């Protein structure tokens, strides 16, 4: 679909086995999640945005659902205050910026 | 043009007459801008994103030409670690998100 930007690109995703709300950031390197409890082995990481860095747990070879396309790849989860869909993702759903 | 996310979507602004490099960014409800001397009236604000706050000088109703697209709208100047397209301008250069 086309999606405008009027209002924050808010998506419903699919990852764990939940259904969320996620907005979806070419300005994002990566995948940041709201704490979640997901199973196995994680790394810690930090990431960085306006204000400074967080702690996060990044997770590999994740399946997420974005809009019924699906992907597979690393998904951070750590105290962010909103579900980010970054191009590491963006790019297999063959998401582009079109003016 | 149509803008693919396998690297930052980054774009030659211009700005009070000089250019500069700036992301692209859906994931940002508004324009940030690293320290520049900008002519016009500006008024105090601060702006939040993953890390915390910071502070920045609000410029209204200013020209900025990106990729080609004039927009005329507000910019945030402060200690930002990356120049950011935010929504607000993002909509008037006609952007959005497809897949
Ligand atoms: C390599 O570094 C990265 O990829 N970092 C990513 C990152 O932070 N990306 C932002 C742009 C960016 C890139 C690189 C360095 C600094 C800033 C942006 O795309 C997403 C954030 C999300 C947000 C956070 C809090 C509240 C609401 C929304 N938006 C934002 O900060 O927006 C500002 C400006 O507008 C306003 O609206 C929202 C808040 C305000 C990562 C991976 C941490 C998400």
């Not at 419903?12 to 996620?22: D, H, V, Y």
């Not at 396309?69 to 962010?80: F, R």
């Given at each position: ?47 960085g ?18 809009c ?22 963006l ?9």
């Open positions: 679909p086309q999606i405008t930007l009027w209002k924050r690109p808010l998506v419903t995703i699919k990852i764990g086995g939940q259904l969320k709300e996620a907005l979806l950031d070419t300005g994002a390197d990566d995948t940041v999640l709201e704490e979640m409890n997901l199973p196995g082995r994680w790394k810690p990481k930090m990431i945005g306006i204000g400074g860095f967080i702690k996060v747990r990044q997770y590999d070879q994740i399946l997420i659902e974005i019924g396309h699906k992907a597979i790849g690393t998904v951070l989860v750590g105290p962010t205050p909103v579900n980010i869909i970054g191009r590491n993702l790019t297999q759903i063959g998401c582009t910026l079109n003016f």
